[PDB]
Amino acid sequence: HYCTLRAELLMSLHDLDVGEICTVDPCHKFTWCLDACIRERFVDSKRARELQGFLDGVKKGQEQVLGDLSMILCDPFAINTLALSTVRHLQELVGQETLPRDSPDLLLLLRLLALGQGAWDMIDSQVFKEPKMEVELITRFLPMLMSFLVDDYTFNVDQKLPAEEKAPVSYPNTLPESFTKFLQEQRMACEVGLYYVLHITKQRNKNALLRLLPGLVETFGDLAFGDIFLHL
């Protein structure tokens, strides 16, 4: 929570228009995008490119700001923004027939969220190196989300097609457990899966909901049992 106040303080200084602090804090230009995204709760591609440039503008010997950026990215509302952007990107990529590995904007979202989630590690020890991603998140976890989604939509299109005989097959409610292994081994995959659970709860499909409700019982860092996802 303190990190959020830090960002707020900076924006309050930006609201005061103090060039003595706006022009010296290199994360001020970063928090332009962070404010414009957190108000929307969505990272559009333009501000994504801007964030990519700000990360690329970090030179050697001044990498402490990355820790500050991770601290600034540890704000839970920013985690909400990045997780919902990832979930909605994965929701809209099914229509275009594009895998998560074929989504450079999504890869940038994964990069930024990974840099954000390791923030307390970067303050505890002064780590100025990027956290690494998971291959199976790109190739198994997110395509398993897509697998569930597009089975649900194929069932829906079948329902909207008439001539269904007696005792129709239910939506497949079996759970692939490598998905749950990634939930209970990767905080990244964990939190994005939690926000996927919240998003399908907004979609309120009981079949996929109770399909994935097993496996959420065991999750990484008790993030499925933390304040954020429980409150949402």
Partner: peptide
């Protein structure tokens, strides 16, 4: 491969 088969299954 499973997801692409799921896509072509949605197209049909």
């Amino acid at each position: 491969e499973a997801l692409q088969k799921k896509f072509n299954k949605l197209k049909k």
